[PDB]
Design a binder for this molecule. Structure first.
Ligand code: PCG
Ligand code: PCG
Ligand code: PCG
Ligand code: PCG
Lengths: 258, 260
């Protein structure tokens, strides 16, 4: 789930993005995917008179040329030459076939390359798939599985993923609140101080699929307890208005008692 | 070269069901029409009884399904995701995205499915207009007469050429007939014959094949064909209208000054 990263100059990052936006087979990727491809590519060089791609071979890498010149042949027929700012080697990866042509260096070249597995991983990181994963998660939460699909979908549309370090206060008692939290990862501790000048008392531990932060949205806008990450925690979070329109009605949430 | 996909004859009602199911699927509705058609024709029938597991999450994906009758249940790690009825695609994610099955699919009743194998799906995914256009380009470049034409002109040729198929024995061109088209042979072979008068039998002139062309003479004189061109085996020509011929190919010395 975690991709390789290679640091690049803005000029390089722009060259690659423009190369992709110029390529007829890839120009319609979502922007976030282009961005991920951009950061993922690692640098590769070849000297003059080298063969980068042999037709018939297994394709593994997709290239963007930053510097140099290559010649593209197929069955001995010259197809074209390509200069900087062009993608090549994407067909074998996009279409799961062998290399459809041969690419040779005419000079020393400087390429950026991404391997097949990274590319395929990124191809699946679309808005529609992220949305679907949010839906699948929500359906796993008993409070929300029973909701109509349209409302789950509306929820999935607005859900924000936030992360908390161990010991981090997700919620402090006594402050206003504007967020409702669903735990997708890890555990939290809930504590409360009854009077001022006192140490907070432990109430309970919540984990994956549990939720919190409704009290300040239902009633007075003051947090009634502390919620502290007890390990590395991920929450799916909902702003006050979304809560009100989409979730505020639910009996299990509205009439929650402790 | 090219693979031939299997054809499975289906009722009109089924073909429409499949077509609609794809166009209703968010991961597939943006396929070209030609691709959706090809999927339609190459899906084959498969049935399952009540309480069968069609797809297990984690497995390598092989087939994409379209349901015509019945109801299936979709779960992931035991979480119920949905039920699906007729007119729905399932099993496309593993194949589209080269991952393992992302969920489990089980039947609730007897089901009637249409299925497409991964060999076909992979073939069809690559049959786009753009890929076809590029194949046209690569072919023209293999023909020395059309190689050295600028890229802009080859691209225009690919835009307007018509790929046409001919039966064995078919007169692609009859001597004496009016003509408006130029032909480039992309596949197969033709025989060229000519008769001195129409009350005489034609004599053999020559045999042409892939990368050869014909039909230029009637575009350069009065539009009358000066010989017969007859398909020998299965023949494919890239066919070019008169105006496109004049603007794009007519200039070429090899074509203009072709002598026989
Ligand atoms: N088949 C083909 N490839 C080309 C052409 N122009 C440059 N290329 C690149 O050369 C590459 C060969 O490896 P790939 O088939 O994976 O991807 C190809 C393209 O990205 C062309 O006109 N035809
Ligand atoms: N008042 C109270 N809040 C709790 C308890 N256990 C979990 N919580 C959560 O801790 C949260 C503090 O922020 P909110 O008061 O807005 O909403 C609260 C609840 O959702 C409990 O026993 N008492
Ligand atoms: N991951 C996922 N698959 C679903 C869902 N609804 C129905 N499906 C189908 O279940 C199938 C499992 O095999 P695939 O992962 O190949 O493709 C999947 C879909 O076509 C859903 O909400 N999530
Ligand atoms: N007149 C003539 N045409 C030929 C000969 N060999 C192949 N051809 C082709 O057959 C075609 C008949 O249609 P066209 O006269 O338009 O153009 C002709 C040529 O392109 C030949 O020896 N004589």
């Amino acid at each position: 789930v975690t991709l390789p990263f290679y640091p690049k100059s803005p000029q390089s990052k722009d060259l690659i993005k423009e190369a992709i936006l110029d390529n007829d087979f890839m120009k319609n990727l979502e922007l976030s995917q282009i961005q991920e491809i951009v950061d993922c590519m690692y640098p590769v060089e070849y000297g003059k008179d080298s063969c980068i791609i042999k037709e018939g071979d297994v394709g593994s890498l997709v290239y963007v040329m930053e510097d140099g010149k290559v010649e593209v042949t197929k069955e001995g027929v010259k197809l074209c030459t390509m200069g900087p700012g062009k993608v090549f080697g994407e067909l074998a990866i996009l279409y799961n076939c062998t290399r459809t042509a041969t690419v040779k260096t005419l000079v020393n070249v400087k390429l950026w390359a991404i391997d097949r597995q990274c590319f395929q991983t990124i191809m699946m990181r679309t808005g529609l798939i992220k949305h679907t994963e949010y839906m699948e998660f929500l359906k796993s939460v008993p409070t929300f599985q029973s909701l109509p699909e349209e409302i789950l979908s509306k929820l999935a549309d607005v859900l924000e993923e936030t992360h908390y370090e161990n010991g981090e206060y997700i919620i402090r008692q006594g402050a206003r609140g504007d967020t409702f939290f669903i735990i997708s990862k890890g555990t939290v501790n809930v504590t409360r101080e009854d009077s001022p000048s006192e140490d907070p008392v432990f109430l309970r531990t919540l984990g994956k699929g549990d939720w919190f932060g409704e009290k300040a949205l239902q009633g007075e806008d003051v947090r009634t307890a502390n919620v502290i990450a007890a390990e590395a925690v991920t929450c799916l979070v909902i702003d006050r208005d979304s809560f009100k329109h989409l979730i505020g009605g639910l009996d299990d949430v509205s009439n929650k008692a402790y």
